[PDB]
Each structure stands twice: as structure tokens, then as C-alpha cells.
Amino acid sequence: GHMGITAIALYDYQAAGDDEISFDPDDIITNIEMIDDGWWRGVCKGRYGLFPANYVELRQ
């Protein structure tokens, strides 16, 4: 519930900025906010930042 909008990573993403996050396939992204277009904001493994929307799959 307090995890908000959540998603499962499909592909490896390696952050390309300090404000970006990294994840591996099957990592979980939580507390997501579709702030801008194809760049969303959420938490993954203690890191809070931007990530590509087309790299993840929303849960439920």
C-alpha cells in the first residue's frame, strides 16, 4: 500500500546520471511516479531516482 505504484524490472539498466537509478532484471521498483513522459521516479534497492519507463513492467 505504502509502496504505491510498483514495477518489476525487465532489463538491466545502468544509471547514466547521479539522479538516475540502476537495476537488474527482476529487481523491484516501488513508490513510482510517472513524472515525465518516459522517465519515471521510484525507489530501487535503497536508491531513489529516475529510470526508463519502458525498462520495467508495472505490477498488479
Short mmCIF file of all heavy atoms in Angstrom, two decimals:
data_model
loop_
_atom_site.label_atom_id
_atom_site.label_comp_id
_atom_site.label_asym_id
_atom_site.label_seq_id
_atom_site.Cartn_x
_atom_site.Cartn_y
_atom_site.Cartn_z
N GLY A 1 0.83 -1.19 0.00
CA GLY A 1 0.00 0.00 0.00
C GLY A 1 0.87 1.24 0.00
O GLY A 1 0.82 2.04 -0.93
N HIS A 2 1.67 1.39 1.05
CA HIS A 2 2.65 2.48 1.11
C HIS A 2 3.81 2.28 0.15
O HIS A 2 4.71 3.12 0.12
CB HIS A 2 3.16 2.65 2.54
CG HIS A 2 2.16 3.27 3.46
ND1 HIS A 2 1.10 4.02 3.00
CD2 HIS A 2 2.06 3.26 4.81
CE1 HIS A 2 0.38 4.44 4.03
NE2 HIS A 2 0.94 3.99 5.14
N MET A 3 3.83 1.18 -0.62
CA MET A 3 4.75 1.04 -1.73
C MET A 3 4.23 1.70 -3.00
O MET A 3 4.97 1.76 -3.99
CB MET A 3 5.04 -0.45 -1.98
CG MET A 3 3.83 -1.29 -2.37
SD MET A 3 4.20 -3.06 -2.40
CE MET A 3 3.13 -3.66 -1.09
N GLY A 4 2.99 2.19 -2.99
CA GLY A 4 2.46 2.94 -4.12
C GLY A 4 2.47 2.12 -5.39
O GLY A 4 2.24 0.91 -5.39
N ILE A 5 2.73 2.81 -6.50
CA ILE A 5 2.84 2.15 -7.79
C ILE A 5 4.17 1.43 -7.85
O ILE A 5 5.23 2.02 -7.60
CB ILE A 5 2.70 3.17 -8.93
CG1 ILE A 5 1.36 3.92 -8.82
CG2 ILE A 5 2.78 2.47 -10.28
CD1 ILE A 5 1.32 5.19 -9.63
N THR A 6 4.13 0.14 -8.17
CA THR A 6 5.31 -0.70 -8.18
C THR A 6 5.47 -1.34 -9.55
O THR A 6 4.52 -1.47 -10.32
CB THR A 6 5.23 -1.78 -7.10
OG1 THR A 6 4.16 -2.69 -7.41
CG2 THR A 6 4.97 -1.15 -5.74
N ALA A 7 6.70 -1.76 -9.84
CA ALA A 7 7.02 -2.34 -11.14
C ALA A 7 8.18 -3.31 -10.97
O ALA A 7 8.98 -3.19 -10.03
CB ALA A 7 7.38 -1.26 -12.17
N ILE A 8 8.26 -4.27 -11.88
CA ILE A 8 9.34 -5.24 -11.92
C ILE A 8 10.24 -4.91 -13.10
O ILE A 8 9.75 -4.63 -14.20
CB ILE A 8 8.81 -6.68 -12.01
CG1 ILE A 8 9.97 -7.68 -12.13
CG2 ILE A 8 7.85 -6.84 -13.19
CD1 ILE A 8 9.65 -9.05 -11.57
N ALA A 9 11.54 -4.93 -12.87
CA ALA A 9 12.49 -4.64 -13.93
C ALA A 9 12.53 -5.77 -14.94
O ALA A 9 12.55 -6.95 -14.57
CB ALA A 9 13.89 -4.41 -13.35
N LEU A 10 12.51 -5.41 -16.22
CA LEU A 10 12.65 -6.38 -17.31
C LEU A 10 14.08 -6.52 -17.80
O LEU A 10 14.52 -7.64 -18.09
CB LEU A 10 11.76 -5.99 -18.49
CG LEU A 10 10.28 -5.70 -18.29
CD1 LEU A 10 9.66 -5.34 -19.62
CD2 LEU A 10 9.56 -6.89 -17.67
N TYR A 11 14.82 -5.42 -17.89
CA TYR A 11 16.16 -5.42 -18.46
C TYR A 11 17.11 -4.68 -17.54
O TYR A 11 16.71 -3.83 -16.75
CB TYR A 11 16.19 -4.77 -19.86
CG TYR A 11 14.96 -5.06 -20.69
CD1 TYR A 11 13.91 -4.16 -20.74
CD2 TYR A 11 14.86 -6.24 -21.42
CE1 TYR A 11 12.78 -4.43 -21.50
CE2 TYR A 11 13.74 -6.51 -22.17
CZ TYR A 11 12.70 -5.60 -22.21
OH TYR A 11 11.59 -5.88 -22.97
N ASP A 12 18.39 -5.03 -17.66
CA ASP A 12 19.44 -4.30 -16.97
C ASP A 12 19.41 -2.84 -17.39
O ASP A 12 19.40 -2.52 -18.59
CB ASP A 12 20.80 -4.91 -17.30
CG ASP A 12 21.78 -4.80 -16.15
OD1 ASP A 12 22.41 -3.73 -16.01
OD2 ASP A 12 21.93 -5.78 -15.40
N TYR A 13 19.39 -1.94 -16.41
CA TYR A 13 19.64 -0.52 -16.66
C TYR A 13 20.79 -0.06 -15.79
O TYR A 13 20.79 -0.27 -14.57
CB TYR A 13 18.41 0.35 -16.39
CG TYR A 13 18.69 1.79 -16.75
CD1 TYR A 13 18.88 2.16 -18.07
CD2 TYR A 13 18.80 2.77 -15.77
CE1 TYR A 13 19.16 3.47 -18.42
CE2 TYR A 13 19.07 4.09 -16.11
CZ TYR A 13 19.25 4.43 -17.44
OH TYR A 13 19.53 5.73 -17.80
N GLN A 14 21.78 0.57 -16.42
CA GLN A 14 22.93 1.14 -15.73
C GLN A 14 22.78 2.66 -15.74
O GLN A 14 22.77 3.28 -16.81
CB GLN A 14 24.24 0.72 -16.40
CG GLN A 14 24.88 -0.48 -15.72
CD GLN A 14 25.29 -0.18 -14.29
OE1 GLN A 14 24.92 -0.91 -13.36
NE2 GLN A 14 26.04 0.90 -14.10
N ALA A 15 22.64 3.24 -14.55
CA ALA A 15 22.39 4.67 -14.43
C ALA A 15 23.41 5.46 -15.24
O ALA A 15 24.60 5.14 -15.27
CB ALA A 15 22.45 5.09 -12.96
N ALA A 16 22.92 6.50 -15.92
CA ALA A 16 23.76 7.41 -16.69
C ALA A 16 23.75 8.82 -16.10
O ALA A 16 24.16 9.77 -16.79
CB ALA A 16 23.31 7.44 -18.15
N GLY A 17 23.28 8.98 -14.87
CA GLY A 17 23.38 10.24 -14.16
C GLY A 17 23.33 9.96 -12.67
O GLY A 17 22.91 8.88 -12.24
N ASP A 18 23.77 10.94 -11.88
CA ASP A 18 23.74 10.77 -10.43
C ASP A 18 22.31 10.70 -9.91
O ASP A 18 22.06 10.07 -8.88
CB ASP A 18 24.49 11.90 -9.75
CG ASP A 18 26.00 11.68 -9.73
OD1 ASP A 18 26.45 10.58 -10.11
OD2 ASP A 18 26.72 12.61 -9.32
N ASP A 19 21.37 11.35 -10.59
CA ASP A 19 19.96 11.33 -10.20
C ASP A 19 19.21 10.13 -10.77
O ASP A 19 17.99 10.04 -10.59
CB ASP A 19 19.28 12.62 -10.64
CG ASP A 19 17.93 12.81 -9.99
OD1 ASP A 19 17.83 12.58 -8.77
OD2 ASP A 19 16.97 13.19 -10.70
N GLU A 20 19.90 9.23 -11.46
CA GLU A 20 19.28 8.04 -12.02
C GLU A 20 19.60 6.82 -11.17
O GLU A 20 20.60 6.78 -10.44
CB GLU A 20 19.77 7.81 -13.46
CG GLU A 20 19.14 8.76 -14.47
CD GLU A 20 19.77 8.64 -15.84
OE1 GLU A 20 20.46 7.64 -16.11
OE2 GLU A 20 19.56 9.56 -16.66
N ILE A 21 18.74 5.81 -11.26
CA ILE A 21 18.91 4.58 -10.51
C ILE A 21 19.35 3.48 -11.47
O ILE A 21 19.26 3.61 -12.70
CB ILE A 21 17.63 4.17 -9.76
CG1 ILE A 21 16.45 4.01 -10.73
CG2 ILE A 21 17.33 5.18 -8.65
CD1 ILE A 21 15.20 3.44 -10.09
N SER A 22 19.84 2.39 -10.90
CA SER A 22 20.23 1.20 -11.64
C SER A 22 19.44 0.01 -11.13
O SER A 22 19.04 -0.04 -9.96
CB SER A 22 21.73 0.91 -11.49
OG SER A 22 22.51 1.82 -12.24
N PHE A 23 19.19 -0.94 -12.01
CA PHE A 23 18.54 -2.17 -11.58
C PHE A 23 18.92 -3.31 -12.51
O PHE A 23 19.44 -3.11 -13.61
CB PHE A 23 17.02 -2.01 -11.51
CG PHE A 23 16.39 -1.40 -12.73
CD1 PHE A 23 16.32 -2.09 -13.95
CD2 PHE A 23 15.83 -0.15 -12.64
CE1 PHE A 23 15.71 -1.49 -15.05
CE2 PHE A 23 15.23 0.44 -13.72
CZ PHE A 23 15.16 -0.22 -14.93
N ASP A 24 18.69 -4.52 -12.02
CA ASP A 24 18.84 -5.75 -12.76
C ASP A 24 17.47 -6.33 -13.06
O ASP A 24 16.49 -6.01 -12.38
CB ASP A 24 19.66 -6.77 -11.96
CG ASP A 24 20.98 -6.20 -11.47
OD1 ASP A 24 21.86 -5.94 -12.31
OD2 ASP A 24 21.13 -6.00 -10.25
N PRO A 25 17.35 -7.18 -14.08
CA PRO A 25 16.06 -7.84 -14.32
C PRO A 25 15.59 -8.53 -13.05
O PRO A 25 16.37 -9.16 -12.33
CB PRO A 25 16.37 -8.85 -15.43
CG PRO A 25 17.69 -8.44 -16.00
CD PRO A 25 18.42 -7.69 -14.94
N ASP A 26 14.30 -8.37 -12.75
CA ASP A 26 13.60 -8.92 -11.59
C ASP A 26 13.82 -8.09 -10.32
O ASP A 26 13.26 -8.45 -9.28
CB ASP A 26 13.97 -10.38 -11.31
CG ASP A 26 13.41 -11.33 -12.36
OD1 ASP A 26 12.20 -11.27 -12.63
OD2 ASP A 26 14.20 -12.14 -12.91
N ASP A 27 14.60 -7.01 -10.37
CA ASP A 27 14.57 -6.05 -9.27
C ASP A 27 13.20 -5.37 -9.23
O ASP A 27 12.50 -5.28 -10.24
CB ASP A 27 15.67 -5.01 -9.42
CG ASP A 27 17.04 -5.54 -9.03
OD1 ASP A 27 17.12 -6.66 -8.49
OD2 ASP A 27 18.04 -4.83 -9.26
N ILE A 28 12.82 -4.90 -8.05
CA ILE A 28 11.52 -4.28 -7.83
C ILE A 28 11.71 -2.79 -7.63
O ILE A 28 12.58 -2.36 -6.86
CB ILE A 28 10.79 -4.91 -6.63
CG1 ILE A 28 10.48 -6.39 -6.90
CG2 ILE A 28 9.51 -4.14 -6.31
CD1 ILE A 28 9.56 -6.64 -8.11
N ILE A 29 10.89 -2.00 -8.33
CA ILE A 29 10.86 -0.55 -8.19
C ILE A 29 9.54 -0.20 -7.52
O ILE A 29 8.48 -0.71 -7.92
CB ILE A 29 10.99 0.16 -9.55
CG1 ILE A 29 12.24 -0.31 -10.31
CG2 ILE A 29 11.06 1.67 -9.36
CD1 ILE A 29 12.12 -1.67 -11.06
N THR A 30 9.59 0.66 -6.51
CA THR A 30 8.40 0.98 -5.73
C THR A 30 8.23 2.49 -5.65
O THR A 30 9.10 3.27 -6.06
CB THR A 30 8.46 0.38 -4.32
OG1 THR A 30 9.47 1.05 -3.55
CG2 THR A 30 8.79 -1.10 -4.37
N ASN A 31 7.08 2.90 -5.13
CA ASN A 31 6.76 4.31 -4.91
C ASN A 31 6.98 5.11 -6.19
O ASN A 31 7.63 6.16 -6.20
CB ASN A 31 7.57 4.87 -3.74
CG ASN A 31 7.22 4.20 -2.42
OD1 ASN A 31 8.02 3.46 -1.85
ND2 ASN A 31 6.01 4.46 -1.92
N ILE A 32 6.41 4.60 -7.28
CA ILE A 32 6.67 5.14 -8.61
C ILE A 32 5.79 6.36 -8.85
O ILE A 32 4.65 6.44 -8.39
CB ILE A 32 6.45 4.06 -9.68
CG1 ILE A 32 7.60 3.06 -9.64
CG2 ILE A 32 6.31 4.69 -11.07
CD1 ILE A 32 7.49 1.92 -10.64
N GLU A 33 6.35 7.32 -9.58
CA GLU A 33 5.61 8.50 -10.02
C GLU A 33 5.96 8.73 -11.48
O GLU A 33 7.13 8.92 -11.82
CB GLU A 33 5.96 9.72 -9.17
CG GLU A 33 5.67 9.55 -7.68
CD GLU A 33 6.43 10.53 -6.82
OE1 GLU A 33 6.11 11.74 -6.87
OE2 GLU A 33 7.35 10.09 -6.10
N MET A 34 4.95 8.68 -12.35
CA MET A 34 5.17 8.88 -13.79
C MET A 34 5.32 10.37 -14.07
O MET A 34 4.46 11.02 -14.68
CB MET A 34 4.02 8.27 -14.59
CG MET A 34 3.46 6.96 -14.04
SD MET A 34 2.31 6.20 -15.19
CE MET A 34 2.03 4.62 -14.39
N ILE A 35 6.44 10.92 -13.61
CA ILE A 35 6.59 12.37 -13.57
C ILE A 35 6.66 12.96 -14.97
O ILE A 35 6.01 13.97 -15.26
CB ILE A 35 7.81 12.80 -12.72
CG1 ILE A 35 8.98 11.83 -12.87
CG2 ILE A 35 7.42 12.94 -11.26
CD1 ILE A 35 10.31 12.49 -12.68
N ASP A 36 7.45 12.35 -15.86
CA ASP A 36 7.68 12.97 -17.17
C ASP A 36 7.80 11.89 -18.24
O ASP A 36 8.83 11.22 -18.33
CB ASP A 36 8.93 13.84 -17.13
CG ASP A 36 9.36 14.28 -18.52
OD1 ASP A 36 8.77 15.25 -19.04
OD2 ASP A 36 10.27 13.65 -19.08
N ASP A 37 6.76 11.75 -19.05
CA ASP A 37 6.89 11.12 -20.36
C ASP A 37 7.35 9.67 -20.20
O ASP A 37 6.58 8.84 -19.72
CB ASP A 37 7.81 12.01 -21.22
CG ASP A 37 8.42 11.29 -22.41
OD1 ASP A 37 7.79 11.25 -23.48
OD2 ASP A 37 9.55 10.77 -22.26
N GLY A 38 8.60 9.36 -20.56
CA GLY A 38 9.14 8.03 -20.42
C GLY A 38 10.14 7.91 -19.31
O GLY A 38 10.79 6.86 -19.19
N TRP A 39 10.30 8.94 -18.49
CA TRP A 39 11.22 8.95 -17.35
C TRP A 39 10.37 9.02 -16.09
O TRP A 39 9.73 10.04 -15.82
CB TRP A 39 12.19 10.12 -17.45
CG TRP A 39 13.28 9.86 -18.44
CD1 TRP A 39 13.37 10.35 -19.71
CD2 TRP A 39 14.43 9.04 -18.25
NE1 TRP A 39 14.51 9.89 -20.32
CE2 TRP A 39 15.18 9.08 -19.44
CE3 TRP A 39 14.90 8.27 -17.18
CZ2 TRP A 39 16.37 8.38 -19.60
CZ3 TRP A 39 16.08 7.58 -17.34
CH2 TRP A 39 16.81 7.63 -18.53
N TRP A 40 10.37 7.95 -15.32
CA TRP A 40 9.62 7.86 -14.09
C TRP A 40 10.57 7.97 -12.91
O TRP A 40 11.79 7.95 -13.06
CB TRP A 40 8.82 6.55 -14.03
CG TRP A 40 7.75 6.45 -15.07
CD1 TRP A 40 7.37 7.42 -15.95
CD2 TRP A 40 6.95 5.31 -15.36
NE1 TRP A 40 6.37 6.96 -16.76
CE2 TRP A 40 6.09 5.66 -16.42
CE3 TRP A 40 6.86 4.02 -14.83
CZ2 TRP A 40 5.15 4.77 -16.96
CZ3 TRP A 40 5.94 3.14 -15.36
CH2 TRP A 40 5.09 3.52 -16.42
N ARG A 41 9.99 8.09 -11.73
CA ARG A 41 10.75 8.26 -10.50
C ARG A 41 10.29 7.19 -9.52
O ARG A 41 9.09 6.97 -9.35
CB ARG A 41 10.53 9.65 -9.90
CG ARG A 41 11.56 10.06 -8.87
CD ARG A 41 10.95 11.02 -7.88
NE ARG A 41 10.49 12.25 -8.50
CZ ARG A 41 9.52 13.02 -8.03
NH1 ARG A 41 8.88 12.69 -6.91
NH2 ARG A 41 9.17 14.13 -8.67
N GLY A 42 11.25 6.51 -8.90
CA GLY A 42 10.91 5.50 -7.92
C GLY A 42 12.14 5.02 -7.19
O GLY A 42 13.26 5.46 -7.45
N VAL A 43 11.90 4.10 -6.26
CA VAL A 43 12.93 3.60 -5.36
C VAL A 43 13.27 2.18 -5.77
O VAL A 43 12.37 1.35 -5.98
CB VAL A 43 12.47 3.64 -3.89
CG1 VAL A 43 13.55 3.07 -2.96
CG2 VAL A 43 12.11 5.05 -3.50
N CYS A 44 14.57 1.89 -5.86
CA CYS A 44 15.02 0.53 -6.13
C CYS A 44 16.26 0.22 -5.29
O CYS A 44 17.32 0.81 -5.52
CB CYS A 44 15.34 0.33 -7.60
SG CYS A 44 15.70 -1.39 -7.91
N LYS A 45 16.13 -0.73 -4.36
CA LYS A 45 17.26 -1.20 -3.55
C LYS A 45 17.92 -0.03 -2.82
O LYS A 45 19.14 0.15 -2.87
CB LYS A 45 18.27 -1.96 -4.41
CG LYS A 45 17.78 -3.31 -4.92
CD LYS A 45 18.83 -4.03 -5.75
CE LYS A 45 19.34 -3.17 -6.91
NZ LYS A 45 20.22 -3.92 -7.84
N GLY A 46 17.11 0.77 -2.14
CA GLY A 46 17.61 1.87 -1.35
C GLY A 46 17.94 3.13 -2.13
O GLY A 46 18.29 4.14 -1.50
N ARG A 47 17.83 3.11 -3.45
CA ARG A 47 18.17 4.25 -4.30
C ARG A 47 16.90 4.87 -4.88
O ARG A 47 16.03 4.16 -5.39
CB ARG A 47 19.09 3.83 -5.45
CG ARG A 47 20.18 2.84 -5.08
CD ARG A 47 21.23 3.42 -4.14
NE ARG A 47 21.73 4.72 -4.57
CZ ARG A 47 22.76 5.35 -4.01
NH1 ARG A 47 23.42 4.81 -2.99
NH2 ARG A 47 23.14 6.54 -4.47
N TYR A 48 16.82 6.20 -4.83
CA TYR A 48 15.65 6.95 -5.28
C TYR A 48 16.06 7.85 -6.43
O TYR A 48 16.90 8.74 -6.26
CB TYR A 48 15.07 7.78 -4.13
CG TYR A 48 13.74 8.45 -4.40
CD1 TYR A 48 12.85 7.94 -5.34
CD2 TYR A 48 13.37 9.60 -3.71
CE1 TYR A 48 11.64 8.56 -5.58
CE2 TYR A 48 12.16 10.22 -3.95
CZ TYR A 48 11.30 9.70 -4.88
OH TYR A 48 10.09 10.32 -5.11
N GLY A 49 15.46 7.64 -7.60
CA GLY A 49 15.82 8.46 -8.75
C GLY A 49 15.05 8.08 -9.99
O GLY A 49 14.05 7.35 -9.93
N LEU A 50 15.53 8.58 -11.12
CA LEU A 50 14.85 8.45 -12.40
C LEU A 50 15.22 7.13 -13.07
O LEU A 50 16.32 6.60 -12.88
CB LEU A 50 15.23 9.61 -13.32
CG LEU A 50 14.99 11.01 -12.76
CD1 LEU A 50 15.71 12.05 -13.61
CD2 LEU A 50 13.51 11.31 -12.71
N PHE A 51 14.30 6.59 -13.86
CA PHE A 51 14.55 5.36 -14.59
C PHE A 51 13.69 5.34 -15.85
O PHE A 51 12.66 6.03 -15.91
CB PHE A 51 14.26 4.12 -13.72
CG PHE A 51 12.80 3.93 -13.39
CD1 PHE A 51 11.98 3.16 -14.20
CD2 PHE A 51 12.25 4.50 -12.25
CE1 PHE A 51 10.65 2.97 -13.89
CE2 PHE A 51 10.92 4.31 -11.93
CZ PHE A 51 10.11 3.54 -12.75
N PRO A 52 14.09 4.58 -16.87
CA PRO A 52 13.27 4.49 -18.08
C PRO A 52 12.01 3.66 -17.84
O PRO A 52 12.08 2.56 -17.29
CB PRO A 52 14.20 3.80 -19.10
CG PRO A 52 15.54 3.72 -18.46
CD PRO A 52 15.34 3.81 -16.98
N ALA A 53 10.86 4.20 -18.26
CA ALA A 53 9.60 3.51 -18.04
C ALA A 53 9.51 2.22 -18.85
O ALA A 53 8.95 1.22 -18.39
CB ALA A 53 8.43 4.43 -18.38
N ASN A 54 10.05 2.23 -20.07
CA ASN A 54 9.95 1.06 -20.94
C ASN A 54 10.91 -0.06 -20.54
O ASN A 54 10.95 -1.09 -21.22
CB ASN A 54 10.20 1.47 -22.39
CG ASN A 54 11.64 1.81 -22.67
OD1 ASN A 54 12.35 2.35 -21.82
ND2 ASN A 54 12.09 1.48 -23.88
N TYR A 55 11.67 0.12 -19.46
CA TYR A 55 12.54 -0.93 -18.95
C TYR A 55 11.87 -1.79 -17.88
O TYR A 55 12.40 -2.85 -17.53
CB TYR A 55 13.82 -0.32 -18.36
CG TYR A 55 14.95 -0.18 -19.35
CD1 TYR A 55 14.85 0.67 -20.44
CD2 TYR A 55 16.14 -0.88 -19.18
CE1 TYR A 55 15.89 0.81 -21.34
CE2 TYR A 55 17.18 -0.76 -20.07
CZ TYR A 55 17.05 0.09 -21.15
OH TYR A 55 18.09 0.22 -22.05
N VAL A 56 10.72 -1.36 -17.37
CA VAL A 56 10.05 -2.04 -16.27
C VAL A 56 8.68 -2.50 -16.73
O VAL A 56 8.23 -2.20 -17.84
CB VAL A 56 9.93 -1.14 -15.02
CG1 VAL A 56 11.29 -0.54 -14.66
CG2 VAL A 56 8.90 -0.04 -15.23
N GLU A 57 8.01 -3.27 -15.87
CA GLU A 57 6.62 -3.67 -16.06
C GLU A 57 5.87 -3.42 -14.77
O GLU A 57 6.24 -3.95 -13.72
CB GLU A 57 6.51 -5.13 -16.48
CG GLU A 57 5.09 -5.58 -16.73
CD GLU A 57 4.99 -7.07 -16.95
OE1 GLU A 57 5.17 -7.84 -15.98
OE2 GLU A 57 4.74 -7.48 -18.11
N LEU A 58 4.80 -2.63 -14.85
CA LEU A 58 4.01 -2.31 -13.67
C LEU A 58 3.31 -3.56 -13.14
O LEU A 58 2.87 -4.42 -13.91
CB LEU A 58 2.98 -1.23 -13.99
CG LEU A 58 3.53 0.15 -14.34
CD1 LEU A 58 2.45 1.02 -14.96
CD2 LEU A 58 4.12 0.83 -13.11
N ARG A 59 3.21 -3.66 -11.82
CA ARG A 59 2.65 -4.83 -11.17
C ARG A 59 1.14 -4.68 -11.00
O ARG A 59 0.55 -3.63 -11.28
CB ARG A 59 3.34 -5.08 -9.83
CG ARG A 59 4.66 -5.82 -9.96
CD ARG A 59 5.10 -6.44 -8.65
NE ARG A 59 5.27 -5.45 -7.59
CZ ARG A 59 5.97 -5.66 -6.49
NH1 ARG A 59 6.59 -6.82 -6.28
NH2 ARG A 59 6.06 -4.70 -5.58
N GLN A 60 0.51 -5.74 -10.51
CA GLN A 60 -0.94 -5.86 -10.45
C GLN A 60 -1.56 -5.71 -11.84
O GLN A 60 -2.50 -6.42 -12.18
CB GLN A 60 -1.54 -4.82 -9.49
CG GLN A 60 -1.49 -5.25 -8.03
CD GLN A 60 -1.84 -4.12 -7.08
OE1 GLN A 60 -1.19 -3.96 -6.04
NE2 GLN A 60 -2.86 -3.35 -7.41
#
